User: What shape does this take?
Amino acid sequence: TLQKQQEEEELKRKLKQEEDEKDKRKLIEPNLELHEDKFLLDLSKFKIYYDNNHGYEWWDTAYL
Amino acid sequence: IKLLGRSRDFFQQTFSSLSGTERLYYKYVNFEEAIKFLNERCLKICHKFFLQLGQIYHSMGEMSRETYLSGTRLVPNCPLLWVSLSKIDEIDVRARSILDRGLLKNPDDVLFYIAKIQMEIRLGNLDQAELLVTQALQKFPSNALLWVEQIKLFKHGNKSSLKKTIFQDALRRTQNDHRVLLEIGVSFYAEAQYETSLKWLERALKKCYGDTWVWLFRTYARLGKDTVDLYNMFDQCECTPREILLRLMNDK
Amino acid sequence: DMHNNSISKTWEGYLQDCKFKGWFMKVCNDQDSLLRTLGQFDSEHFYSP
Amino acid sequence: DFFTPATSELIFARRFLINYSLERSRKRLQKEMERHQKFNTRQELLSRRTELQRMANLELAGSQLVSTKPISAVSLSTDDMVVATGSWAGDLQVLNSQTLQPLTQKLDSHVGKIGAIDWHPDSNNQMISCAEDGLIKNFQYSNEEGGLRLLGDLVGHERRISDVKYHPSGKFIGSASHDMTWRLWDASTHQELLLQEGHDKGVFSLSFQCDGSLVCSGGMDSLSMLWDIRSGSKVMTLAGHSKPIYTVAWSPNGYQVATGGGDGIINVWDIRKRDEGQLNQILAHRNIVTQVRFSKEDGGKKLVSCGYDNLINVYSSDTWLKMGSLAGHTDKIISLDISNNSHFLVSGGWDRSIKLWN
Amino acid sequence: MSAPNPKAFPLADAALTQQILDVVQQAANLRQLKKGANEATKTLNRGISEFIIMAADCEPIEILLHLPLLCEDKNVPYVFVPSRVALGRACGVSRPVIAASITTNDASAIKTQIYAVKDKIETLLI
Assistant: This one.
């Protein structure tokens, strides 16, 4: 009789997983193809560049 | 019921309880019909029904160009959809982009060019029309009508030399085609030397169609007297047709 | 049933240096290992989602 | 190699540049800093998506006729109210943007083939045009007058001058031609401040930056060569291209640049990262590329590309995914600009119309 | 070579130049070619031309310099190849030939080679 309970466990778990997926989809709705990763703003690199410069771009840093 | 109708609405109604059928029916409902089309048509190609619509509103009048905007966007093949739509919008140009819009959708057909040419001609600037011609003609060239406007463009086309040679090639490329033959004979006519035109005129007639005859009898109208017999050939070329010929004759 | 199957040109053009020594047809099941498979030749962008 | 100083006062100008540069850039960079703070992923994720449809939306409204020749250069005065249109006829004129009916006035230049025509950065009553003859032109567009008129003349390219641009200052102008030298002039006095060398073929195209410090220099050798102005220092130089570069496009970002040319492929050169984030290849059209633009306001998001493909494109500033193509024309497409408000699109071409887009 | 004429607009390089002249000579054998300035000029007004070629080494350059102007008007691709004598040999003529013109035909067997060349031409014109 273990076949019935087992199939309920596997099937229900798979459904729960896929539903978690689509839930993440409409939830975000960075995606993947959307690559939205590159829309994100990292204070890390931008900043550490910023004061890393002597503070003004990297271009004219030579002068002052 | 047609030639009899030509001199029976109900018999078509019971014969109707009994797609070009309901079409000719709509043609009957013409001389108001708004319900007849908005119902008998709404079952139903459809493009002719659009035409008749924008004709109705057209003599009425904007809702016309509205419904063109409808059928056009619904069925982008028969050009006269746009040709009309534009042809209104031009008079109120924005019209071009309407032309081009529909064009790029086939585009690859024939007419839309001709449309665009004539629209420029009608509007002005023959000079671009030259371009449009030469382009579509490079593409197509076995297409006659192109050669027609090519020829018209020398009426006031004011480049005098090549007309000879062009009449030449316009002939030979096209497997000499009656429509051109006319157009040549005309360009003689609207200038002079009406007899010169004749050999062309008849020369096409042997390939026949009304678009000539009116000219033919304008030529006679400048010379004349063969009038009576050739009416037989007209009787072979087929409604009040004698009304038509004599009608358009009066235009000139 | 291929009547749904459709082929179309994307484009054609020039390239600084070919990273292809020889021509191989293959599969990568996802888009990712597929796009990555392009990206080993740095070719990812050639595909249009 | 030769590094030869001369003619101070431009160094003075360079002095000027520095002060103008750092400030704006600083402020600009600072502002970009601010945005990092906000983040809010799902805002952008929606907003981007929204714009996508509008971009997919855009349609031709009405076109026009202008001249009988290909229409070589179009543009908008910064107010987005008028189109500067020059062309192979050697003719200029200015048209009503939103609308297109007929025009302000059609004045024929004294030159016969017109590379590009460009608006003063502020007053917006003034234009500049690069020519076939080796002459550059400043004009006055008068009010709603047809008052297109000489504001002056500029001299000394011995080839066709393929491009000219106002420096975001407005005192400074540049021209890339063929003579394999790109020149930087004072607007006001109408005087050359610079003759730059260093392209092994003609110098085809030109771009400044928002911050005004960098001028990217496009050339006919497929080498996009970058220049600090104030020092006249070649900084970085970019071969992504086989066959000559045509459009040198610049982001309002000020840290990014696009290029297009004979290859039929666009590169996105992102500057600062400089190790490899470098370029990114956009397979672009086919059949060359003519002009490329970022949305002027908004820092640039959308990319607009005009090739001979007869199409015109829309690219995302980051995925650089091809979003949509717009069937615009019967013929090949020589030039384009875009509403600073990003709601319209103006193209011109061989087919000789000038077409407006939604 | 020499300092090429600043009036010379699009000027093919070698690898193209080959493909061009080779198409010319490929044409003369079918006498789908038409040679010489005046007779190019005819072909244009008649509108039957495919593309053009013009010797850019020519003596005073204006003598053909209407041809470009005429061509934008009729909208036809046109090039300059650097060596006239080369063009001359390539056309079947023993003697300098300043400008020469392909013509139009459908059944023309080469028709492809022609097209592919027009393609590679317009690419130059900006």
